[PDB]
Amino acid sequence: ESWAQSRDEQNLLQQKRIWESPLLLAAKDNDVQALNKLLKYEDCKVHQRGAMGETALHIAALYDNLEAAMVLMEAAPELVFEPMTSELYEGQTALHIAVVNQNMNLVRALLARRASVSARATGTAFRRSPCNLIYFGEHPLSFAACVNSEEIVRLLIEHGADIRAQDSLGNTVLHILILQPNKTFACQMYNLLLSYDRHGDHLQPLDLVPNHQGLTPFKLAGVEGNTVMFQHLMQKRKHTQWTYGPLTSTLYDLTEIDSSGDEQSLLELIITTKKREARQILDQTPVKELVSLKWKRYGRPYFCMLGAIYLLYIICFTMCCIYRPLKPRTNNRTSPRDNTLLQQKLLQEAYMTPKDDIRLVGELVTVIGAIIILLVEVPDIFRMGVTRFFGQTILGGPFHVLIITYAFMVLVTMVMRLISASGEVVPMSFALVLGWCNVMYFARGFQMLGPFTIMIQKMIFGDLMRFCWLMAVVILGFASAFYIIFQTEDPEELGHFYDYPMALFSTFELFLTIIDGPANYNVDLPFMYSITYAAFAIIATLLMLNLLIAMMGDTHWRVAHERDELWRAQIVATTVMLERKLPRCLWPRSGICGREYGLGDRWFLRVEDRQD
Amino acid sequence: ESWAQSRDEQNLLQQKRIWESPLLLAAKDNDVQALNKLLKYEDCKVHQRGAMGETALHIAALYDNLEAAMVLMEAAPELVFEPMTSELYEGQTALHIAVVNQNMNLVRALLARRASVSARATGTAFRRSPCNLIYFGEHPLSFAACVNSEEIVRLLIEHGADIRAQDSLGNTVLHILILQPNKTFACQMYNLLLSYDRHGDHLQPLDLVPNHQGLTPFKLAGVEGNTVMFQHLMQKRKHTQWTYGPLTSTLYDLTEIDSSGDEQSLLELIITTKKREARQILDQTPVKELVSLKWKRYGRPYFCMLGAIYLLYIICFTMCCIYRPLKPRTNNRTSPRDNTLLQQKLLQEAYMTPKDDIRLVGELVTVIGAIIILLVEVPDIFRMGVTRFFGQTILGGPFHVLIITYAFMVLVTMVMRLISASGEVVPMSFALVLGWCNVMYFARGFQMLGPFTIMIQKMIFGDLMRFCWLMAVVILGFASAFYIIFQTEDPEELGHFYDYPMALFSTFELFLTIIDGPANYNVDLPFMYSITYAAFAIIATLLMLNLLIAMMGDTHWRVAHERDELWRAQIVATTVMLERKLPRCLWPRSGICGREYGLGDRWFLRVEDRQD
Ligand SMILES: CCCCCCCC/C=C/CCCCCCCC(=O)O[C@@H](COC(=O)CCCCCCCCCCCCCCC)COP(=O)([O-])OCC[N+](C)(C)C
Ligand SMILES: CCCCCCCC/C=C/CCCCCCCC(=O)O[C@@H](COC(=O)CCCCCCCCCCCCCCC)COP(=O)([O-])OCC[N+](C)(C)C
Ligand SMILES: CCCCCCCC/C=C/CCCCCCCC(=O)O[C@@H](COC(=O)CCCCCCCCCCCCCCC)COP(=O)([O-])OCC[N+](C)(C)C
Ligand SMILES: CCCCCCCC/C=C\CCCCCCCC(=O)O[C@@H](COC(=O)CCCCCCCCCCCCCCC)COP(=O)([O-])OCC[N+](C)(C)C
Ligand SMILES: CCCCCCCC/C=C\CCCCCCCC(=O)O[C@@H](COC(=O)CCCCCCCCCCCCCCC)COP(=O)([O-])OCC[N+](C)(C)C
Ligand SMILES: CCCCCCCC/C=C\CCCCCCCC(=O)O[C@@H](COC(=O)CCCCCCCCCCCCCCC)COP(=O)([O-])OCC[N+](C)(C)C
Ligand SMILES: CCCCCCCC/C=C\CCCCCCCC(=O)O[C@@H](COC(=O)CCCCCCCCCCCCCCC)COP(=O)([O-])OCC[N+](C)(C)C
Ligand SMILES: CC(C)CCC[C@@H](C)[C@H]1CC[C@@H]2[C@H]3CC=C4C[C@H](OC(=O)CCC(=O)O)CC[C@]4(C)[C@@H]3CC[C@@]21C
Ligand SMILES: CC(C)CCC[C@@H](C)[C@H]1CC[C@@H]2[C@H]3CC=C4C[C@H](OC(=O)CCC(=O)O)CC[C@]4(C)[C@@H]3CC[C@@]21C
Ligand SMILES: CC(C)CCC[C@@H](C)[C@H]1CC[C@@H]2[C@H]3CC=C4C[C@H](OC(=O)CCC(=O)O)CC[C@]4(C)[C@@H]3CC[C@@]21C
Ligand SMILES: CC(C)CCC[C@@H](C)[C@H]1CC[C@@H]2[C@H]3CC=C4C[C@H](OC(=O)CCC(=O)O)CC[C@]4(C)[C@@H]3CC[C@@]21C
Ligand SMILES: CC(C)CCC[C@@H](C)[C@H]1CC[C@@H]2[C@H]3CC=C4C[C@H](OC(=O)CCC(=O)O)CC[C@]4(C)[C@@H]3CC[C@@]21C
Ligand SMILES: CC(C)CCC[C@@H](C)[C@H]1CC[C@@H]2[C@H]3CC=C4C[C@H](OC(=O)CCC(=O)O)CC[C@]4(C)[C@@H]3CC[C@@]21C
Ligand SMILES: O=c1c(-c2ccc(O)cc2)coc2cc(O)cc(O)c12
Ligand SMILES: O=c1c(-c2ccc(O)cc2)coc2cc(O)cc(O)c12
Ligand SMILES: [Zn+2]
């Protein structure tokens, strides 16, 4: 916005000041004879500051003018130690520019005059940001690795580059290559930089050194969805046991992958990333066999056991609403439109028989069970929802909004029972619907979990809610029309639209065709009704048929074209929740440990397969 | 047509008159034995103007006969200066014919005898028309460039042919190459014709010469959807500022692209054309970030401000119709089928209480708001086209008609209130439905409802005008059957078909299954009722299933795959509309004026990308 306008004016007044200054211009235009005349005129203003604090060496390096960049050196050798001074390109020297532009003959002549290989481009354009378009690090050795130039990397380290150097984000030169868009070229540069880590006394192998978020180069490849570097780093963690003809028993490490409770694991960090490429890591041969192992053995059976206890809680709540205390009414019927026969009992007369004491036991099971919902989930939606992730699990999305809304409605029914307020049917009727609609979500884990089952259910609900916005204006147009047509008529003969909230609810029902069209045949209806309702019935039929076709066309686009899994991240983030809630004695750790088989303290997973 | 019938007659009349004359036949069949004999007989009629006014030299050129064409030229050299004189081929010389046929040895012999390279073939088979298979221009350079003849366009320019000659449409040779089906050969011939503009002292260059519609070759590539010539002509408008490794900062021109405020810009021409491949130019590089810049900063805020003001205007109109002046009726009910209790107040009765004065404000808001609709949208719907430019504003413009018909219905209700006419429910009922269905227009300005409203609104008028004719045939056949069956019965029990306009409305409702099938069970219905209604129920089931299968084929399959491109084409069409009507004080001009940066008085767009 205001900042994007600021970058654009900054680049235009850069080119404006390179044209209105001759030594900046000849460095750009590679006018080698124009340098000799101006520099012999008593070295005029060789300490230039252009738009981005640039000197004339920065211009000559930027446009790959090797012949013009030489003349600046013998004229004043103090320009090779000069950075750019603006906020956007802060700290960038000429050695950074020639490395990114891959100018071989220039970068030797810079090192020939002792250019610092440990400079730090701290500017706002050299920071990881979606507004920035490249993130190449902060060091010249980091710039050489990202543009894929093997010969510069061998040249820079020879002059003393530090491969252990880190950024302001803590990323070393091996963290940055995982962030690069071309994966295959970054895979060759990874093997190169590890070969120069001879260094057996640095107390840490360099591909274990964490950034300021604690992530290793292994975990960062799992978070950023870099599947090419993930499979490359996994051969460091395999161990082939035997090969019996076509069979092979491979043993995987599972130290930085499986959860230990005290530390965030790779399975959790894929979920909170919310990226589309990070879910491809869940398809990989150590991780894919781990998720299906614990969602077959502990994760799924405990999911169905918690849903069976919730079903007994809602049945116990349902019985207390059916047998709610009611007495015949005390006052007389006011209007002839008053249908009410019964009313609620007061608190003193609610409990005076032994059959009410059986109900009182059931009413206390409900309230105690409603507090437990608040005591375990008011932490959860703070932890889960706004901090890490929301709506990408099974039992997920509008489950946690609704079951919190359930337990709120039960405690409202308790208050209205105590102060003997009228209208407890209103918090109960919400709580029956809210409570039983949550049972449909536990029914989602009774499935074999295909790749396009839960996301299609989530999709169809998403299109129906978009259809309800477009049909609200169609109802409001025709309900207002139907209201003023029958506004001069007698509602004893046709009372579908007798006041305006009823006319709105009738037109909603006629749209879905769940009540019949109004007709009497013993009296003359207005003529404007018949042509309006014939227009309404054609519109409502076509809009309901186009809804079905639009759900078919949107189903095809997300199965055949969007090509996103969604089905492994749902069973991961469900299994993470049940593992933090249950104690350790009910949850054995997946894999098998060492010290009785002699491999360490590490929890290995054996995978046996057939090559064919 | 008898036009195309008359064309085929003279194509056979041409072949007859050649086959009659021995001179014309020997030119055709390349019988040079007969050529020397017919000249030594007599200097005969070598100006035999046949059916389509041609000579023997034209026939030697049409059938590619080198030896026959030469003998005509030495015997009578005055035939090279002869055009065809009919209506279908007016002005075409023999030089036009040999150039299209690419008989390049004949081109040397014709240019030796100073054949006119500036003759204009102004025939009806040379104008641009959808009934002609060719549109190659009117000039021999225009004919040579479109058949991809590099050797003849080099030959004709050397012999004094004008490159900047125009048709009777203003099209130069550069315009016509854009109108050719082979885009690849059009680009190579385009570069060759600019290389012969070395003698530029003329006020406009060739690529900056408009036709009679004012379009340049760059704009005509935009209108016709020629994306191949569009990207190649955009290289002349670019200006690369710097290159930093994989980064590139390009600076686009935006002179013939952006809305200049006076002349119809390229964004306006692509929206208001009846084509489909022009909509791919909306995804080209300078155009895509231009309209994204306008929509994020000024398009979407202004569209949602107008959307919220319109919604409050319709709620104010709705409450003035709910509280419309009604009083109890004066006279008594005539028949026992009279249901009416109330009627309209008179004008002197309608405003007596202060509750009416609150309605009097909201009725003035409604009337004033309806005049503004007829002053923003009427003085551009006649001054920018009354017929078929009007119709272009209706094809992709179905909410222009709805909001103008709304504004007339509000003003009809005003006049009937002033003259105290009875029947205001008839203009109001149209105005309530047309008022609330225009809210669906503003659904395009949202990501969540954007592509989904495309799928819901799209319906085919080929298979739905088929259904609505086949629905009306079933209704007329079965309501007439249902009428005469119950014509001898008592309508007190079953009154669904008591007179013939009601039987049409009941069978319409039974076809859509929105009222129940008539039944009593306390009385004996006729036997023909059960036979007919069972046949009617199967036919109505059949035609509903025809409508579903028709809505699943070859158009909804395309809209499901193109819903995002169609939604962005609505964003561009809205942004163009809002930029014209809003003043320049609320809409700043897009780009950056390069006046204070030494670039001329132009507005530039700076685009930065990564080339990888
Ligand atoms: C009847 C009308 C009144 C209701 C209006 C309000 C209702 C909401 C309407 C809102 C406006 C209409 C737009 C559609 C809904 C959002 C768009 C969407 O993405 O759809 C999503 C629906 O949502 C889910 O099923 C997943 C859960 C995430 C969202 C949380 C819902 C809020 C809970 C409160 C709910 C109400 C309970 C409140 C009362 C207690 C799914 O779309 P998808 O992308 O195809 O799915 C792929 C999953 N993926 C995204 C992970 C890849
Ligand atoms: C999430 C997907 C769905 C979308 C949600 C919204 C869906 C719609 C939900 C609607 C919920 C209810 C809204 C209106 C309720 C008022 C009724 C009332 O009190 O009537 C009173 C009158 O007063 C009125 O009639 C005021 C209503 C007129 C304007 C309608 C409100 C516009 C909705 C805003 C949003 C729309 C925009 C949404 C689309 C952009 C009493 O009238 P009466 O008893 O008949 O007696 C009158 C006296 N007389 C006899 C002299 C005549
Ligand atoms: C592209 C899709 C759109 C198609 C449009 C179709 C929509 C239909 C448009 C309908 C127009 C609006 C409705 C009014 C029509 C009723 C006329 C009337 O007033 O009846 C009066 C006279 O009764 C008659 O004699 C009428 C007989 C048929 C004439 C009218 C339909 C034309 C038939 C051909 C159709 C042409 C169409 C060609 C094929 C489609 C009074 O009725 P009654 O009191 O019962 O009098 C009976 C007296 N009796 C008791 C002695 C017996
Ligand atoms: C696994 C799931 C799969 C599905 C299987 C489901 C399992 C089986 C499902 C249901 C069991 C079988 C049907 C029950 C019928 C009850 C007997 C009856 O007919 O009514 C009789 C009495 O009954 C009562 O009055 C009940 C009063 C409220 C009881 C609340 C539950 C207490 C449970 C305690 C804790 C539970 C622990 C739960 C938490 C862990 C007759 O009553 P009445 O004379 O007609 O009316 C007057 C009563 N009034 C005076 C109060 C108004
Ligand atoms: C004691 C507490 C329980 C503890 C149990 C401990 C062990 C539990 C362990 C495992 C339990 C489950 C193992 C069953 C075998 C799996 C088959 C399956 O999932 O069906 C199908 C899903 O269809 C469904 O949605 C459910 C089908 C079953 C009906 C309802 C189950 C019980 C509901 C309540 C009744 C009372 C039960 C609760 C009592 C209150 C499979 O679908 P699909 O074939 O893959 O379709 C793919 C098609 N596609 C590829 C095109 C997309
Ligand atoms: C997303 C947004 C949603 C929320 C939006 C709000 C939605 C809901 C809003 C309000 C709810 C509805 C009202 C509540 C019910 C009380 C009724 C009442 O007492 O009113 C009384 C007066 O009222 C009228 O006469 C009608 C009002 C005139 C239309 C609006 C005028 C305001 C103009 C300003 C325009 C501002 C700018 C406009 C735009 C540029 C009716 O009393 P009565 O006794 O029945 O009258 C009968 C008298 N008679 C018999 C002689 C006829
Ligand atoms: C009557 C009362 C109505 C309600 C009150 C109105 C509100 C106040 C009144 C007027 C002010 C209107 C908004 C002006 C300022 C906001 C503009 C803006 O900056 O864009 C913002 C959003 O913008 C929106 O989402 C607009 C939502 C407001 C409601 C639109 C009203 C029209 C609805 C009626 C017709 C339609 C329904 C049709 C139904 C068939 C930015 O866009 P973004 O997507 O957030 O960016 C991505 C976010 N990210 C960068 C972090 C990733
Ligand atoms: C004034 C009226 C409209 C009441 C407003 C409440 C409803 C808008 C919401 C509240 C929670 C309900 C939900 C409760 C649970 C269901 C199951 C559903 O998830 C499923 O298991 C079915 C699979 C699928 O989503 O397609 C998602 C929402 C739904 C239909 C409901 C949608 C609508 C309901 C009635
Ligand atoms: C599903 C598509 C076709 C429409 C989606 C719109 C719904 C989200 C809304 C708007 C229309 C409905 C409303 C229609 C009118 C009624 C009036 C109702 O108040 C009364 O019934 C009073 C009746 C009386 O006074 O006689 C409150 C909300 C309700 C059920 C509805 C609440 C929600 C509904 C389902
Ligand atoms: C009181 C009663 C008699 C009012 C009757 C309402 C009709 C006069 C209007 C109001 C809303 C409708 C319109 C709303 C929008 C559509 C778009 C449609 O197709 C298009 O123009 C392009 C497709 C698209 O919408 O994107 C043509 C007319 C149609 C069905 C409608 C034509 C007529 C309808 C039924
Ligand atoms: C006196 C008794 C009958 C009280 C009711 C039983 C409760 C002790 C249990 C069983 C049903 C409840 C559960 C209902 C559902 C949730 C989700 C949870 O599953 C997940 O964490 C995954 C959610 C997701 O992946 O989106 C399992 C337990 C929890 C919080 C609840 C924990 C405790 C509750 C209140
Ligand atoms: C007393 C005052 C405050 C009442 C408010 C008046 C507005 C409700 C109306 C008057 C005329 C305007 C409208 C004039 C025309 C346009 C375009 C739009 O219809 C189209 O022409 C686009 C249709 C298409 O391109 O397909 C509908 C509403 C809009 C933005 C305007 C919406 C709001 C406006 C300001
Ligand atoms: C292309 C679209 C418009 C659909 C094509 C079908 C409609 C043109 C026709 C088919 C039969 C219907 C008609 C059938 C009979 C009725 C009689 C009605 O006259 C009356 O007086 C009502 C009956 C009575 O009160 O006696 C006015 C027209 C109506 C609703 C209908 C008008 C339009 C309908 C939907
Ligand atoms: O059930 C249907 C049918 C349907 C299904 C089977 C038939 O034999 C006929 C219609 C058509 O459109 C719908 C459209 C809808 O929006 C919802 C539906 O349930 C249906
Ligand atoms: O035509 C469809 C569609 C379909 C897809 C996208 C659309 O826009 C419309 C229909 C989906 O599933 C089918 C499934 C079928 O067995 C047969 C079909 O013809 C279809
Ligand atoms: Zn497809």
Numbering used by the authors:
A (entry chain A), B (entry chain D): 27 to 638
From the paper:
TRPV6 is a representative of the vanilloid subfamily of transient receptor potential (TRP) channels that serves as an entry gate for capturing dietary calcium ions in the gut1–3. In a nutshell, hTRPV6 is assembled of four subunits and contains a transmembrane domain (TMD) with a central ion channel pore and an intracellular skirt that is mostly built of ankyrin repeat domains connected by the three-stranded β-sheets, N-terminal helices, and C-terminal hooks. The TMD is composed of six transmembrane helices S1–S6 and a re-entrant pore loop (P-loop) between S5 and S6. As in all representatives of the tetrameric ion channel family, the ion-conducting pore of TRPV6 has two narrow regions, the selectivity filter formed by the extended regions of the P-loop and the gate formed by the S6 bundle crossing, separated by the central cavity in the middle.
The second, predominant population of particles yielded a 2.66-Å 3D reconstruction with no symmetry imposed (C1), which had two densities of the size of a genistein molecule that had never been seen in TRPV6 reconstructions before. Further analysis showed that this second reconstruction represents a genistein-bound inhibited state of the channel, hTRPV6GEN. In contrast to hTRPV6Open, the gate region in hTRPV6GEN is narrow and fully sealed by the side chains of L574 and M578. Overall, the structure is ~4-fold symmetrical but shows noticeable deviations from the 4-fold symmetry at the intracellular region of the ion channel pore, around the two putative sites of genistein binding. Close inspection of the hTRPV6GEN cryo-EM map revealed two densities of the shape of a genistein molecule at the intracellular half of the ion channel pore that were not present in the hTRPV6Open map. The upper site (1) is located above the gate, at the bottom of the central cavity, and is contributed by the S6 hydrophobic residues M570, L571 and L574. The bottom site (2) is right below the gate, at the intracellular entrance to the ion channel pore, and contributed by the residues M578, G579, H582, W583 and A586. Two strong densities at the pore intracellular entrance, located two-fold symmetrically relative to the central pore axis, are observed in the cryo-EM density of hTRPV6GEN. Each of these densities is in the middle of three-histidine clusters, which include H587 of the B/D diagonal subunits pair as well as H582 and H587 of the A/C diagonal subunits pair. When binding to the open TRPV6 channel perpendicularly to the central pore axis, genistein molecules pull one diagonal pair of subunits (A/C) asymmetrically towards the channel center.
